[PDB]
Design a protein around this motif. Structure first.
Motif, PDB file in Angstrom:
ATOM      1  N   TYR A   1       0.831  -1.198   0.000  1.00 41.77           N
ATOM      2  CA  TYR A   1       0.000   0.000   0.000  1.00 41.77           C
ATOM      3  C   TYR A   1       0.870   1.253   0.000  1.00 41.77           C
ATOM      4  N   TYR A   2       0.466   2.256  -0.772  1.00 39.95           N
ATOM      5  CA  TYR A   2       1.195   3.517  -0.815  1.00 39.95           C
ATOM      6  C   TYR A   2       0.267   4.682  -1.142  1.00 39.95           C
ATOM      7  N   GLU A   3       0.749   5.899  -0.911  1.00 40.59           N
ATOM      8  CA  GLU A   3      -0.012   7.107  -1.220  1.00 40.59           C
ATOM      9  C   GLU A   3       0.891   8.153  -1.862  1.00 40.59           C
ATOM     10  N   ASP A   4       0.428   8.743  -2.960  1.00 36.94           N
ATOM     11  CA  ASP A   4       1.208   9.753  -3.667  1.00 36.94           C
ATOM     12  C   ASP A   4       0.474  11.089  -3.693  1.00 36.94           C
TER      13      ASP A   4
ATOM     14  N   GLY B   1       1.930   3.712   6.964  1.00 38.37           N
ATOM     15  CA  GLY B   1       2.384   4.971   6.401  1.00 38.37           C
ATOM     16  C   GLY B   1       1.623   6.159   6.960  1.00 38.37           C
TER      17      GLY B   1
ATOM     18  N   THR C   1       4.135   8.012   0.962  1.00 41.83           N
ATOM     19  CA  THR C   1       4.249   7.083   2.082  1.00 41.83           C
ATOM     20  C   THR C   1       3.773   5.692   1.685  1.00 41.83           C
ATOM     21  N   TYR C   2       4.607   4.684   1.930  1.00 41.61           N
ATOM     22  CA  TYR C   2       4.244   3.304   1.618  1.00 41.61           C
ATOM     23  C   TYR C   2       4.334   2.399   2.846  1.00 41.61           C
ATOM     24  N   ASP C   3       3.507   1.358   2.869  1.00 42.66           N
ATOM     25  CA  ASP C   3       3.471   0.425   3.992  1.00 42.66           C
ATOM     26  C   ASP C   3       4.372  -0.784   3.753  1.00 42.66           C
TER      27      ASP C   3
ATOM     28  N   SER D   1      -0.827  -3.305   3.485  1.00 41.72           N
ATOM     29  CA  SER D   1      -0.058  -4.107   2.539  1.00 41.72           C
ATOM     30  C   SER D   1      -0.321  -5.595   2.734  1.00 41.72           C
TER      31      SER D   1
ATOM     32  N   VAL E   1       9.582   0.192  -5.880  1.00 35.41           N
ATOM     33  CA  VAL E   1       8.682   1.331  -5.723  1.00 35.41           C
ATOM     34  C   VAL E   1       9.235   2.568  -6.427  1.00 35.41           C
TER      35      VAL E   1
ATOM     36  N   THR F   1      -2.050   7.816  -8.585  1.00 29.63           N
ATOM     37  CA  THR F   1      -3.087   7.025  -7.930  1.00 29.63           C
ATOM     38  C   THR F   1      -4.475   7.386  -8.452  1.00 29.63           C
TER      39      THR F   1
END
Lengths: 438, 438, 438, 438
Positions: free
Chosen positions: A16-19, A36, A55-57, A64, A83, C11
């Motif tokens: 899992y991630y957020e951009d 994250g 931020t990524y898990d 994740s 990543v 995303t």
């Protein structure tokens, strides 16, 4: 938003991630055993500053995937690499915490710093936690770490509360630095992780990073609290400071292990001060590069000199009124209408102080594109590729393919309050359209 | 075993060929008027040395078809080209005798040297047998060869007993260097050929090979009997020596024309020595460039010196065990799993002395990398292309258009079951993989 | 289940949603800071009533993605429009709560009411929360809402416990209307939202909806609590009632803000009463439209008047004996065998009087289809098309493109319990077979 | 990781499943109202023993979808069937808990036992919970279960804290057998499920499984806590014991209903013991029949006694080295190469202790046999059929329709890279090969 990094049996190990945000990419790597979302105080200050937060898990933690394999720092770094390759980040900043610092130092050593402009180590493990006959600067023998692994496998849920007490120093910080509701979420985040990850991760805490430290050539920041329990300061940062003297060393007075929340005022202050000093050199390098493409359209003479100074004062931040400018820009003898539009376009992207009331016609008819339906139908196909684009290096590359006609209309879309994209990719379209006229 | 190389009305033109042993392919091309069975002494030593022996019978001779068309070296080379392509030989060696030496020079000139590693001309025709005004260094006028054709047309069978009498020097070598029974069989091989072939072939002897000599850009070997009655050494090998001084020159003293049998103990010695050196040079030249690519994936330091030594030691054939290497490679501080999988993939190829044991486990785990649905299935796309590619540069160029995640995955396929392709094509992937990650 | 409603950087902004039941699509839009699962008490009531419940999670809240861009009602309505279009809903009822009442009025005033049948406003934000000199009907000045945002940014998790204490009025309802376990769950959802989403949401509370109210040309329902602590009833619904008077105004006595869980009995009763009072006019002139096609097959005489009452005394809601009709429809002189199975089919759907036993024979022999494989293979084609059908028109437009003989067999499976459809789909078939007899 | 098991209107019904480790697949099915994470202690010991653990979340519970349809064991079994087929599990083991024990009995009854090797019923519902007139050995009338559903519909969340209070016996096991934090997480797993699921699931508890019990033709394990408050042992396990006396019966004294956590040290001991015996029996029963087929290919004499012993010694797991066998097998007077390749192919499978080394050379040479253009390409035809075949008899039947030259060639393919398929399918080829050559 998920990024695949591995493959376990019939499943795929997804992370899992957020951009979020637009600008210089700042990758955040959490610690044990959170997600994250733990950077929510840091991500807040990085967004208000103008940085792009990612931020990524870690695998087995957060949202994740939770595989029972690949729990060493060679796998944890191979995930970070994938990543960065998938996101195609360039000149980014890696900021680690707890276990997160173990990936920042391993990736840099194993994969290089081609995509790295600066790094940071908040409450780091470096260089070594394990106390052996080789390394006296360790924190505890292997019997201690084996005591934790067994204590997790017995009851990992009951183990968390004890861990989150030595994480924030609740007997000192609760009701002051951190609320019990804030603690509850950290537990909820940990309990919603992989059971195998909670029991395999502590076996990576005592990793030897002494070989990875010398490979740090980029500017670095070392930060650590003086009341850390999980990672004693005299066994980590104090001896990390001697291994890499090039890095700035900051000790937060009276801070626990989870100083990301308790001392958010202190951490964010030092983190932003470091970035704005180690990224200023490249953050304006584009401003002189964009200036270069812009000036390569202006016919040489007395105009080219003043225009260049109308870009210097504006890019820097000097007070400039558009009415004297835009009027002056219009009534030009040697400037072709198309260049008037590009200048009128760029001069609006760089200042938020246009009074927000009026628009100009000389540019509006320049970024027209004749009015051809086919010319407009291609311009929207570019904006479609630009609304899903992030970098300046990517926006220029794409907008160099389309003809000079479609580029003009696409610039109009953004200028005429129709389309909307970040100012970093807006320069991309501009600098790409400028290369066409060369 | 036959190979179709053309078509003649209602009948197809097929050539009898044989394939023996495993190793570096050595194509043996016979001369007039024998067949592929004339190499039965050279084809013996080559098999005991570890080569792959391939003998094919020229059209009109041996067990091959007996057409009445295409008796010229332009057609003969096409026959050789068809055989090479059908067998898909890579980095093979061409060795010719008498007429066979003409099919080596003509192939290289017309078709190239992509499949050829080295060539050899035993009792050669080169460069020009016909004694003309512009070519003083001939052997006989056209009035002579026209006498031979007429001599064959009168009595083909009675002609042989006079030809073989000078082919072997049976007034000097009979019952000593060559048995009577050995002659009788060679006569049987001649009488069982095409009647039109035995009348058309002598007209191909005075072919100008001066247009084919400069095309040779591979190591060559010029060997010729000093007492060659049929093919004078002073009119061939001596002048041929000036046209190609790069070739290792060898004169066997007191040897006739059929020195493949009478002087097999000298020819085998020279041919093996040439092959064990020229091929050894290519296995070293295009191996040190692999090290160059490998030493671009490894960070500078002692590891760029310890691997460099362990590579140059392995390349030099110094006796060592992989279990020391494969373990020492594993426990390494800086290297990432990917570059630990590339190194192991090279050590398995460059060390044939594998104790006769298994493969490894860490290279299998690092090579595949992710196993992405399309990226792993873009590794099987390259796997179909490399199986058809024959060179080192060719393998490098194609795989350079693929991602490092696809190259690694493609290397994972080859490592499991090799192969298919050769090491010169496998290295073409490794060097391309290292070239990407840079 | 997710629906892509946008694209933030690399995303895709996806919204979580659920779709249960069959009938009139009732969309449920939640409020700050809960999610779509907060309607769980209303969803259970609407499913038993015979409706179709569609709940979805707002961006940054619940189980949806948590971006940092697009936190305004113009964007919130853009998502709602995409959800409505993707599902392709028609005659849909929009119900909102708190922050969810703003998306109902904004969508209805920008995208039209083509897919809308009625609307509902529970704990409304309308028409204006902000208190300026332009309107005394505001709740609080700008200086108040800035205090909320600052409180969220300080401690997001501690803010909730003080927010949920005024949400349900725990000094009034705790231990009575709502248990502490219900509060903890509401907190668990608020904590698992977005960090940026929780602080950028209160700034959308004081959105002005005054220019969106007259656009509402559909039956509405303005419901509110007379004990609301978050949204003062005097500043919202009391003045909303004057801007929308033709809407059923209901004030739940002593109800807090979280009345969806506390006064669920009072809300569901008022909501179901409105769903019947607004959709009754459309079921009429449809049930009579159904009857219109039904009576057409009946020969014009004394029987076409009797069967009219036998239908209109069932469509209204009265009860009757299935045995009486199925013996009065069976033993009949004027009606053809086919139109007996038709009336026997319409009755079997419009009657609740099951009596709990065996299923008629004459309708089976009427809706048989001659036992023809070709005609019966065409029957299952409609069933697959009707199982994916929703509206009455959509069923009639498809069931009219088949032979009248095939429709009989298709009404056989639905009768013989071998296939299942809805009510408007079933009548769509019957009223199509009736059209094919003219 | 999800698996689609149905469809609900606009949304698809997906189930969250996990796949861990390598070995004999063990499917763990959870109960009400938890998820697959409730096996985190059983899923630990199974991984340390060398099994493959597969946990999937029932619809409406855990991270799976939350539809409002298909809450019955006929649908639940279909969900399990879809999962098993999608994962293509062969000779797996089904272990259920609470509600999960109903999905084990229903699957075997409706779908068969081709994929199932053994089953286990931990705290089972069997055979019938509803106390009727024909079934005296019930637990409670329907007036009781209807009280539970009503209790959940009132307050789902407050209901759990009373359910888990008896699920674990927290007046006896709290803070001793099960921690407080362990309870809280189990509550979170419950509150995060489908609201309609928690109201519909209790109606599935009183399902008659007497129609599913006789269908069980595999080894079973009936384990139940003596102090089970939720599911009385005297009304289930005692009567279930009479219906299936073939099952190993185990009563854990003083264990509640949630004995997976409180008595994990007892459950893991029993479950491992049952698996290490019942599976061991199948690995011996269907291994001695292989010897029977093998000892039909070997001529009578000492070789039919020396191989017989060396087979029965290997089958018994007596420690021996293949290099003694593989060499002694080679130098054998009577045996033909074919039956020397079959024996070696068995010794590589039945002896996992392969010194961690290579394969063999004589078996590779004998297996392929001829490599006939069609016969070798009829071995890849069977290779596509055996990869889909799941049983031993199934593999035997298909390969019995192929020639011994094709079977040998097909065995040559499996030996090189196995596999794909399993040993029970590989033996299906070996026994079929031996059956042909007779």
């Amino acid at each position: 938003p998920f990024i695949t990094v591995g493959q376990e049996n019939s499943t795929s190990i997804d992370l899992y991630y957020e951009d979020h945000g637009t600008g210089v990419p700042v990758v955040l790597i959490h610690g044990f055993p959170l997600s994250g979302h733990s950077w929510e105080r840091q991500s807040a200050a990085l967004l208000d500053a103008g940085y792009r937060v990612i931020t990524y898990d870690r695998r087995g933690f957060g949202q994740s995937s939770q595989p029972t394999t690949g729990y060493d720092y060679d796998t944890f770094a191979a995930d970070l690499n994938t990543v960065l390759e998938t996101l195609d980040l360039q000149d980014a900043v890696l900021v680690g915490f707890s276990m997160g610092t173990g990936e920042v130092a391993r990736y840099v050593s194993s994969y290089g710093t081609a995509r790295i402009a600066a790094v940071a180590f908040l409450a780091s493990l470096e260089p070594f936690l394990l106390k052996t006959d080789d390394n006296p600067d360790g924190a505890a023998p292997q019997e201690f770490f084996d005591g934790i692994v067994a204590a997790v496998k017995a009851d990992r849920y009951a183990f968390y509360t004890g861990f989150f007490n030595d994480f924030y120093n609740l007997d000192e910080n609760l009701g002051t630095r951190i609320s019990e509701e804030a603690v509850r979420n950290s537990w909820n985040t940990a309990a919603s992780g992989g059971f195998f990850a909670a029991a395999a991760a502590p076996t990576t805490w005592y990793t030897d990073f002494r070989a990875d430290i010398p490979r740090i050539d980029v500017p670095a920041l070392i930060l650590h609290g003086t009341g850390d329990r999980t990672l004693p300061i005299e066994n980590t940062a104090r001896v990390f400071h001697k291994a890499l003297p090039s890095a700035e060393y900051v000790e937060v007075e009276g801070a626990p292990h989870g100083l990301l929340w308790t001392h958010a005022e202190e951490v964010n202050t030092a983190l932003l001060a470091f970035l704005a000093k180690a990224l200023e050199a490249q953050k304006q390098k584009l401003l002189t590069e964009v200036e270069t493409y812009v000036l390569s359209i202006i016919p040489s003479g007395p105009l080219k000199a003043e225009i260049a100074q109308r870009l210097e004062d504006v890019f820097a931040g000097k007070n400039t009124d558009l009415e004297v400018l835009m009027e002056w820009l219009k009534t030009r003898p040697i400037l072709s209408p198309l260049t008037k539009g590009i200048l009128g376009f760029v001069f609006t992207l760089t200042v938020p102080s246009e009074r927000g009331l009026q628009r100009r016609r000389f540019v509006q008819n320049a970024l027209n594109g004749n009015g051809d339906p086919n010319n407009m139908d291609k311009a929207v196909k570019l904006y479609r590729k630009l609304k899903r684009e992030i970098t300046f290096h990517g926006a220029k590359e794409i907008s160099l393919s389309y003809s000079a006609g479609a580029l003009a209309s696409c610039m109009g879309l953004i200028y005429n309050r129709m389309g909307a994209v970040t100012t970093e990719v807006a320069f991309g379209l501009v600098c790409a359209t400028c290369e066409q006229i060369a």
